[PDB]
Structure 1
Amino acid sequence: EMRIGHGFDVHAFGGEGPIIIGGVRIPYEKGLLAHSDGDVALHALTDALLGAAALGDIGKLFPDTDPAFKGADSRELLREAWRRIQAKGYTLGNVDVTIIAQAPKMLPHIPQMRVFIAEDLGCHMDDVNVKATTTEKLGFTGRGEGIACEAVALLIK
């Protein structure tokens, strides 16, 4: 059988650039405020993968009280999430990630996001979709206040 997972993440702008989206450093006037590297795309993708194994979420797997992964970048977190999913029997069906930002432009950076995700999951490029949209200057993303990301995943049990 197959299993569905969903992830959703939001960070507000603040501090100095650059931002890091899908493992890719992107120059911007502002950074993204977060407890770690603020990678909304990898954070949402990890939640979607973990969800499709009902492992709760990032917060459950890497809690307050566990020093092991404190200060770890999102790719480190993604890989360890994967390792722990792959060992529960699951293999990868496919993923689709949707970044929601008015700015910066994401389009030129998406190719390398896809490469980094494929590497971290040990899968073909063909199993990884990443796209970006604006909200036409509407809402807290449209006004340039933060970045949101939605992600969905299908795993084979």
Structure 2
Amino acid sequence: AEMRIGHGFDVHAFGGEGPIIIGGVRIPYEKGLLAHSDGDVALHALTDALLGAAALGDIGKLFPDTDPAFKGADSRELLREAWRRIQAKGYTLGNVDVTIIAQAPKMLPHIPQMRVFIAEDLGCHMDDVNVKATTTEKLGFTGMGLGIACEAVALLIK
């Protein structure tokens, strides 16, 4: 059994009306997130971490910012699709860990539901999906409420 590591990172800016979608979960907030998809940084970062582990590039590589094939869709579809590909190459999920970086809104109440979504989307047990949040103690663009960042790592098995 060969094992593979992956990393992902994403940022999206605030704009317009709430809510925001993070980890599939619709979360109420004063601002919404500017996006060409649904702006779900958590799932984008996770997808990159997963793809990178399977050495398949990134989301922008699999789903061009323009292309007809998979266009203007919600990030859960993109996640499921990438996982389809990652499995086609003969990988199963080791586990994933996600780190949301945001000053607000409060993510912790929504994390259990995010895990239901991700566990479903990758067809695994919840105990292989972990999600956290942190603030930057009001420092930097996230700390000064301009956007949200997210990091994810992934482990795969062949």
> Fold conserved (TM > 0.5)?
yes
For normalisation by structure 2, the TM-score amounts to 0.97
Alpha-carbon distance in structure 1 between the residues aligned to 2:118 and 2:142: 24
Residue 133 of structure 2 aligns to a residue whose secondary structure is strand
Alpha-carbon distance in structure 2 between the residues aligned to 1:53 and 1:116: 21
Residue 77 of structure 1 aligns to a residue whose secondary structure is helix
Alpha-carbon distance in structure 2 between the residues aligned to 1:27 and 1:65: 29
Structure 1, residues 67-112: CA drift from partner, whole Å, max 9, x if none?
1210110000000000011110101000000000000000100000
Aligned pair count? 157
Q: CA RMSD in A?
A: 0.7
Shift of 1:66: 2.5
Matches within 5 A, 1:7-156: 7-156=8-157
Alpha-carbon distance in structure 1 between the residues aligned to 2:83 and 2:144: 35
Alpha-carbon distance in structure 1 between the residues aligned to 2:139 and 2:102: 11
Alpha-carbon distance in structure 2 between the residues aligned to 1:123 and 1:38: 24
Alpha-carbon distance in structure 2 between the residues aligned to 1:115 and 1:4: 23
Residue 5 of structure 2 aligns to a residue whose secondary structure is strand
Does the C-alpha gap of structure 1 residues 64 and 20 become closer, same or farther in structure 2, counting only changes over 3 Å?
closer
Alpha-carbon distance in structure 1 between the residues aligned to 2:45 and 2:65: 19
Alpha-carbon distance in structure 2 between the residues aligned to 1:100 and 1:124: 25
Does the C-alpha gap of structure 1 residues 16 and 130 become closer, same or farther in structure 2, counting only changes over 3 Å?
same
Residue 35 of structure 2 aligns to a residue whose secondary structure is coil
Residue 98 of structure 1 aligns to a residue whose secondary structure is strand
Structure 1, residues 18-49: CA drift from partner, whole Å, max 9, x if none?
00000000011100111110000000000000
Alpha-carbon distance in structure 2 between the residues aligned to 1:151 and 1:55: 16
Residue 129 of structure 1 aligns to a residue whose secondary structure is strand
Shift of 1:65: 4.7
**Which portions of structure 1, spanning 4 or more consecutive aligned residues, are displaced by more than 6 angstroms?**
none
Residue 73 of structure 2 aligns to a residue whose secondary structure is coil
